Write a protein that binds this ligand. Structure first.
Ligand SMILES: C[C@H](CC(=O)O)NCC(=O)O
Ligand SMILES: C[C@H](CC(=O)O)NCC(=O)O
Ligand SMILES: [Fe+2]
Ligand SMILES: [Fe+2]
Lengths: 294, 294
């Protein structure tokens, strides 16, 4: 019964009714994926799933990868990444209020996955949602001088700013954790732009949260002001979130968000209050790498 | 009944018998302090003290200052800093295995105290002790080219390497803690050498743990190799601890160590094993600042 209702023209997003991951056909999945690659966000409606069913759904779209730090993992389905501030039997499950910064998922890793799935569990009614920027479209809207300046350049991405302290880190000297992070997840180099392997779009692959430097073709660093100007032009420095590149995606119970993790950067919008909020995440590799240079 | 038995000649240290902090006279305290300033380490023998009595003893020597991070504090006497890996009723008291790096206490703070007191509580029999270097004597033993090179220079000291993660830091992004530490305890500048206000000695006031840069009189940084050469010449890079500047101080139950926190740097020697070890610390300001430029 799957019906895809794409937003008109250039507007981002699509709504998907009648989707049952257990009965959807191969053609259903291919159509769904194609909507993800061209409309960037697919909101599956009326999803009422167990953790095992959410994983099964992600497995229809590609190969799931479990987040590399175990404290994020759901206790029954290790492939599920949990953002939660609601204890269960008094125990912290997952990590509170993940993602409160512009990023693409796994951008700081050598081999980022193409598709992110979010299944919200507990949703505040007030100021909850996810901000998105389409960095393909943000590239196209760059001034021509900036496009020329970044041609041929490379960016370095690192988790070093937003790596979250883990329970066993208590009482350790902070430099030991800083060095461990650099050792286990060293900064990764990507071309500043790449060609989206599904659509052919040019994507400006940077985020304020993870992108820490930009450099010329030899790997010689450039003034970080160049990075700051790219963040500013693309809307990532606008603390009011009114910039034209920014799309605010809300969601209601039963929604399941699936989105293009090559093209989009995003940032969790949370309440300014201690209100319960829980989301489950599955992240999958599709039929191609992030770009064909991987 | 206090009797001070100073080690002969130039050898470091003294033993103190018959000391009762509650009955010792003003002349006893003045003699004890003078031994601390000239012999650098005073081991008080046969001390059998409650936490309140240990604080009272420190108060005979000067004005106690409580460590600025509360997780180190003894639960009854906030002025007592606790190094402990032995839980009490299951609860972590103090901080495990503090000081496993060369430093002077509070060297990273604007106004370091002159006297450190250690009252060991649980002592492993095997490889336990405290390494010390007399940085006055280490200065005098520097080659003449090095003495000239550091003349007029300044060093910056920071807790940024060995600040210990606190329980409430769990799940925070690490950059937020890094920035908090820089904000609350910014790096402090001291002259590279100063005149010991009690003895007139020239002290080379650096430690591998806290000293992060050296700079000329204008505050222009110098090559950090200059700092590395000072650490190397003074014995702080010798991982075998056999260098001639190094003194290993052991202790037995009832010992109470009191030492010159202007002249000495030190480093905890712990077992290579998970063996119980507990020490209490009181730190006091005496009649003068660290040096007369404070
Ligand atoms: C550091 C972030 C997780 C978080 O915000 O806690 N990494 C998420 C990801 O890249 O998939
Ligand atoms: C960071 C150190 C404490 C420790 O080793 O945990 N400061 C001790 C002091 O300066 O008095
Ligand atoms: Fe994310
Ligand atoms: Fe110390």
């Amino acid at each position: 019964r799957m019906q895809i209702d794409e937003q008109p023209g250039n507007a981002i997003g699509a709504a998907v009714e009648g989707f049952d991951h257990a009965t959807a056909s191969d053609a259903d999945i291919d159509a769904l994926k194609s909507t993800i690659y061209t409309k960037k966000i697919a909101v599956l409606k009326g999803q009422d799933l167990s953790p095992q069913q959410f994983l099964a759904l992600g497995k229809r779209l590609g190969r799931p990868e479990a987040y590399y730090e175990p404290m994020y993992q759901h206790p029954e389905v290790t492939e599920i990444f949990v953002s939660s501030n609601v204890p269960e039997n008094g125990k912290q499950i997952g990590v509170p209020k993940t993602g409160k910064f512009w990023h693409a998922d796994y951008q700081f890793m050598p081999d980022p996955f193409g598709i992110t799935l979010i299944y919200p569990q507990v949703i505040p009614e007030k100021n909850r949602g996810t901000y998105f920027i389409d960095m393909g479209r943000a590239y196209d809207r760059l001034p021509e001088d900036l496009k020329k300046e970044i041609s041929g350049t490379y960016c370095r991405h690192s988790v070093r700013k937003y790596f979250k302290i883990r329970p066993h880190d208590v009482y350790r000297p902070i430099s030991e954790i800083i060095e461990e992070v650099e050792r286990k997840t060293p900064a990764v180099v990507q071309p500043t732009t790449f060609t989206h392997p599904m659509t052919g779009e040019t994507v400006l692959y940077i985020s304020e949260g993870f992108t820490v430097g930009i450099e010329d073709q030899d790997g010689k660093p450039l003034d970080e002001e160049l990075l700051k100007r790219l963040f500013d032009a693309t809307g990532q420095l606008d603390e009011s979130f009114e910039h034209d590149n920014i799309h605010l995606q809300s969601f209601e119970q039963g929604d399941l968000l699936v989105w293009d993790n090559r093209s989009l950067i995003h940032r969790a919008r949370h309440t300014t209050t201690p209100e319960p909020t829980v989301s489950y995440r599955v992240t999958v590799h599709d039929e191609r790498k992030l770009h064909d240079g991987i």
